[PDB]
Design a protein around this ligand. Structure first.
Ligand SMILES: [Ca+2]
Ligand SMILES: [Ca+2]
Lengths: 132, 131, 132
């Protein structure tokens, strides 16, 4: 197939509660129309091997940033960022995994808050490497 | 078939804002689309492309700001700073539909970049899907 | 078709400099390249390969230095340090032409790597273009 998305935050995301989905407000790309910006979720259209990458810039405040890459309800990989000045800092990670159709991939803001601007520091992408 | 991977092996500390990040070592250039002296990727065919970069800043108390550029537009950005002062890494990625002739490059908005033979500061891109 | 994704779920604080980063779980191993106990990717066919890694350091004031190695050579490197001390992330990537039999692996030059069930410390690679 052909599946690829790239989303960014152009405004701050500061959730009321812990463990909320990171939703996005700008698509850089949505080849295959698999990503929903308003839920921040990737909906796997076909069984195959997929790559995901994300970079999240934290607010310059004295709260650490914890981000999980989620597969449905499971933690796949996580990222951490914190600076005590306080300064902005970047939580990043990646994953390559076999998915089944209907699987949902998303970013969970476990703790902290994420910076957004037109310069788009905070990003989330994925694509299909191998079908099957 | 398109893929490049470039590295900085000596420091880049321009003095002024908004300079192009030029590279002095190619780890890869399948398709010969990257100009080292220019630090520019020249899109050879319409398609979906992936880019990734990691920039290590100098151990100085001036923040590092880097933009991934599409032609003259800022696409995604990265920030890094530590007040100790210590080295720190500005990184991001993007997946984009490009048209032939489009140019992708890194802009050093502010700050300075560390370069050595161990190659901390890198920039790569490749063709995901043709058309 | 080749792709692997590995993570560390327990800490790695070797003792000696320049030790191989070994992993304890594969998130994927399409093509059954890469062995867990050595932490090495065994190139199965001539071609172009992409590698990416994220290493979270222990919160100690010893800097983390990581090398991506091709056989016995340093390809690209990552650095992370925070003087608080706080956890921090060493990350990099590379795209390179390989020959079959070439070995790709991560070297812990200095420092220590954090591992937990949340998987902050990861290493993946996949085949971009096979050489026919
Ligand atoms: Ca950092
Ligand atoms: Ca810091």
């Amino acid at each position: 197939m052909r599946v690829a998305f790239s989303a960014a935050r152009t405004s701050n995301l500061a959730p009321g509660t812990l463990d909320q989905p990171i939703v996005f407000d700008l698509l850089l790309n949505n080849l295959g129309e698999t990503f929903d910006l308003q839920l921040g979720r990737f909906n796997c259209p076909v069984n195959g091997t997929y790559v995901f990458i994300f970079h999240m810039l934290k607010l310059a405040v004295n709260v650490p940033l914890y981000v999980n890459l989620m597969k449905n309800e499971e933690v796949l990989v996580s990222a951490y960022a914190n600076d005590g000045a306080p300064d902005h800092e970047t939580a990043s990670n990646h994953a390559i995994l076999q998915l089944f159709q209907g699987d949902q991939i998303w970013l969970r803001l476990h703790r902290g808050a994420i910076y957004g601007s037109s310069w788009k520091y905070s990003t989330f992408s994925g694509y299909l490497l191998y079908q099957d």
